[PDB]
């Protein structure tokens, strides 16, 4: 199941749940999101949201950076979406010749 | 809590169980070798200088 | 219901069969078969009513067993729980008693996995 780490930060069950809510955007692709891991951290210049997820066709590893934590969590999701979609459709790329 | 502690290790204790090794060089409480009075790290430093009699890098 | 309240497995060696009584392990097993001079190798289905009653008689009389053994364990825990000691507390929650780590595991006391 889904695990979130807050590194050198205190975050609420609210913020935690909001992460589950943004991550669910990945269920769109209808494949097994296996032991997804979200990490939240506050660098000098803004927050960082890292995630590492394995699916039947591979791994999603990506990282968001923004002055705003919520905005970084989103940028994380985009990077994850793009990778996941690249995983799911790259195989179709060469059915001919 | 450090120098007070690098000190409380030297002082003879109210009960013998409280005896514990500190590295005689750096004060580190953990990973302290009986034979040298050294922690694992210091041991590496001196040994690299050659300030440990007979002690050399083993390879087999 | 041969000994004592329980019908110990026929087809088995008496040393083993007796182990199928609540309160009798390998140890107490070898012990009774000596104190009543019977061969452990004898299949229960091969005991003289004589050999049998010897076994029965001893065993019921020397050691607390079945229901009475359980009652005591219940009674022991019963009291530990009521006096309010720390071992009593662990019983009062169904948790482990012998200092085990409970951050993970602990499943035999807890029961299989409970949703969140």
């Amino acid at each position: 199941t889904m695990n979130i780490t807050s590194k050198q930060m205190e975050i609420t069950p609210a913020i935690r749940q909001h992460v589950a809510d943004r991550l669910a955007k990945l269920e769109k692709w209808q494949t097994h999101l296996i032991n997804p891991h979200i990490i939240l951290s506050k660098e000098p210049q803004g927050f960082v949201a890292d995630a590492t997820i394995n699916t039947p066709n591979g791994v999603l590893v990506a990282s968001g950076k923004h002055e705003d934590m919520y905005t970084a969590i989103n940028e994380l999701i985009n990077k994850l979406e793009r990778q996941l979609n690249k995983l799911q459709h790259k195989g179709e790329a060469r059915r001919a010749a | 809590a450090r120098k007070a502690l690098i000190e409380k290790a030297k002082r003879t204790p109210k009960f013998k169980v409280r005896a514990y090794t500190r590295c005689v060089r750096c004060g580190r409480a953990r990973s302290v070798y009986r034979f040298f009075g050294l922690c694992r790290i210091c041991l590496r430093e001196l040994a690299h200088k050659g300030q440990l009699p007979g002690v050399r890098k083993a390879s087999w | 219901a041969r000994i004592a309240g329980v019908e110990i497995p026929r087809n088995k060696r008496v040393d083993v069969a007796l182990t199928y009584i609540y309160g009798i392990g390998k140890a107490r097993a070898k012990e009774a078969l000596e104190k009543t001079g019977i061969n452990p190798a004898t299949r229960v289905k091969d005991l003289t009513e004589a050999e049998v009653v010897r076994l029965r008689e001893y065993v019921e009389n020397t050691w607390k067993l079945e229901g009475e053994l359980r009652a005591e364990v219940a009674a022991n825990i019963k009291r530990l729980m009521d006096i309010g000691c720390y071992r009593g507390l662990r019983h009062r929650r169904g948790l482990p008693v012998r200092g085990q780590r409970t951050r993970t595991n602990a499943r035999t006391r807890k029961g299989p996995r409970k949703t969140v």
């Binding site: - | 034979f35 041991l43 590496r44 040994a47 007979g54 002690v55 890098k57 390879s59 | -």
Partner: protein, 97 residues
Amino acid sequence: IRIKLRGFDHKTLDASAQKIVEAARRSGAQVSGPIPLPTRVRRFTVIRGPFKHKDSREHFELRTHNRLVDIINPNRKTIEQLMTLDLPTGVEIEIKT
């Protein structure tokens, strides 16, 4: 009549066992030549870096070598020049009878 040679340096062990077994073979008389006893080994295995990194180590060893020579026919023209013989620093000597 036993001389026992122990040190941390094996080149200086054969040094002393040369210059000792040479002394008595001169001024009388029977030397039981330098015997190489098995070495006692003290290993030091240590995490290289100061923090975490458990899987990288550096192996150190301490060779305390062992030698023994016997002076069989004693002949005390030796037992004097032996009260005066030049020890390299890195070695201890043991004589008892």
